[PDB]
DNA sequence: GCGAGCG
DNA sequence: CGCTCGCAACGCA
DNA sequence: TGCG
C-alpha cells in the first residue's frame, strides 16, 4: 500500500511496510509493524529518559535480521527536519554529525529506517569529550552464561558499590550478560573514565578470582566471567536500554531492579512482552539522573593499582589512536 | 530504506 | 526510468 | 584484500 503518516508527540513521521517480516521465527508477531509497535510503546517514556541529548549508532536491517546488516553511525546528508544531529570524534580524530535522540520521533524514525538496535555514546550532546555514564559490562565466557552474569552483578559487584558510596543501575543485554551504569558527573575524559572502569573491574575480579576475569587474552580467561573494560573506550557503545536484538525472538535490553535481577531469565523480555511487563511497574533506573557522582571512589581505586604495579590494559586490536594519543 | 550515481 | 550501490572506523591475518 |  502507500505509506502512511504517524504523528509521534506532535512531529509527522512517514511509515511504511509495516508487514514486512523482520524476524521470521515470530511469524505475525516479528513484523517491522511490530517491532514500530514496540517502540511507539516505549520512546515517549522510559527509553527517551535514557537516550535524552545522546549521539545514537544505527543497527539496521531493512530486510530483517536474516538479510543485509547496516552499521550506520553518519547521518544522511538529506533527512528530515525533524531529526537532530550533533558533532562526535572518532579514536582517529575523524569528527562526524551523529544522530541526536532528542524526541520520541526520532527513535521512530530510526525504527521506520529498519533499526532494530539503537547504540547510544556515553557522552551528552554538546560536551561529547567527557562520558557522563561508565558502563560495566559482564561478559560471559564459553562455559557461563547468564546465571553467572546475575550472581557476580547481585553478590559481588552491587555490595562493592554499596561499599565505594556508588549507586549503579542494571539491565539485562538482550545476549547472555548484564550491563550496569553508573551516572557520572561529565568532568572526565574516555581515558580517565576507562581507566576507572578497569579499576572497578580488577576490583571486581579480585574479590571472585575463580567466577571472574579481566585478561585480555582469551586462553587465560577459561570458564569465567569477563568484565570487558574496553567498553569505556571512545566509538565502543552499547545497545541501548530498552533496544531490540538482533536474535531470533527479538530480545529486548530490559531495565531491572538489583532485587528482579537476582532471578531475572532475559529471554522473558522482547519486543512482544516489554510493554505489557511495564505497565503499574515502577521504572527501576527512575533515579538514574537525580545523583551526578564524583569518578573519586574509582580513581582511588586505580591509584591503589598504580601503587600495585598496575597500569593501563590493552584496547581492542582493532582501536585507532589518535595522533598525540598516549599508549595504546 | 533510501538517496546518489550509472546507463 | 530502472537498477545497483554504499551505509563502520579501523588494525590485522 | 578481506575479517570482524
Ligand atoms: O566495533 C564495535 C562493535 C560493537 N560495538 C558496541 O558494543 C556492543 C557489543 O556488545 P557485546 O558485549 O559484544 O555483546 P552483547 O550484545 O552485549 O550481548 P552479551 O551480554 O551476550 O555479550 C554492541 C555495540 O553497541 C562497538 O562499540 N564497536
Ligand atoms: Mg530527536
Ligand atoms: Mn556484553
Ligand atoms: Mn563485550
Not at 546488516?69 to 569528527?95: A, M, N, W
Not at 565505594?164 to 545476549?175: A, C, D, F
Amino acid at each position: 500500500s502507500a505509506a502512511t503518516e504517524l504523528d509521534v508527540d506532535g512531529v509527522k513521521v512517514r511509515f511504511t511496510n509495516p508487514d514486512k517480516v523482520y524476524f521470521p521465527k515470530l511469524g505475525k508477531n516479528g513484523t517491522k509493524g511490530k517491532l514500530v509497535e514496540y517502540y511507539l510503546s516505549v520512546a515517549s517514556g522510559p527509553m527517551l529518559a535514557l537516550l535524552r541529548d545522546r549521539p545514537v549508532h544505527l543497527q539496521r536491517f531493512p530486510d530483517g535480521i536474516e538479510g543485509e546488516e547496516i552499521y550506520q553511525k553518519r547521518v544522511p546528508q538529506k533527512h528530515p527536519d525533524y531529526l537532530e544531529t550533533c558533532v562526535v570524534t572518532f579514536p582517529s580524530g575523524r569528527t562526524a554529525d551523529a544522530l541526536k535522540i532528542t524526541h520520541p520521533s526520532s527513535i521512530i524514525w530510526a525504527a521506520q529506517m529498519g533499526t532494530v538496535t539503537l547504540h547510544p555514546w556515553q557522552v551528552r550532546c554538546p560536551d561529547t569529550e567527557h562520558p557522563d555514564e561508565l558502563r560495566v559490562d559482564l561478559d560471559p565466557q564459553p562455559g557461563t552464561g547468564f546465571k553467572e552474569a546475575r550472581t557476580v552483578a547481585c553478590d559481588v559487584l552491587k555490595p562493592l558499590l554499596d561499599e565505594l558510596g556508588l549507586v549503579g543501575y542494571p539491565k539485562t543485554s538482550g545476549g547472555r550478560g548484564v550491563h550496569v551504569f553508573l551516572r557520572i558527573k561529565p568532568q572526565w575524559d574516555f581515558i580517565e573514565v576507562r581507566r576507572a572502569g578497569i579499576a572497578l573491574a580488577r576490583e571486581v575480579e579480585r574479590r571472585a578470582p575463580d567466577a571472574v576475569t579481566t585478561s585480555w587474552w582469551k586462553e587465560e580467561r577459561g570458564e569465567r566471567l569477563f568484565i570487558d573494560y574496553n567498553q569505556n573506550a571512545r566509538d565502543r557503545t552499547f545497545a541501548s536500554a530498552y533496544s531490540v536484538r538482533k536474535t531470533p525472538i527479538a530480545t529486548v535490553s530490559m531495565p531491572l531492579s538489583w532485587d528482579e535481577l537476582r532471578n531475572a531469565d532475559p529471554d522473558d523480555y522482547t519486543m512482544n512482552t516489554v510493554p505489557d511487563l511495564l505497565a503499574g511497574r515502577d521504572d527501576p533506573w527512575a533515579d538514574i539522573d537525580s545523583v551526578q557522582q564524583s569518578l573519586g571512589p574509582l580513581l582511588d581505586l586505580v591509584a591503589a593499582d598504580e601503587e600495585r604495579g598496575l597500569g593501563d590494559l590493552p584496547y581492542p586490536p582493532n582501536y585507532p589512536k589518535m595522533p598525540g594519543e598516549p599508549p595504546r
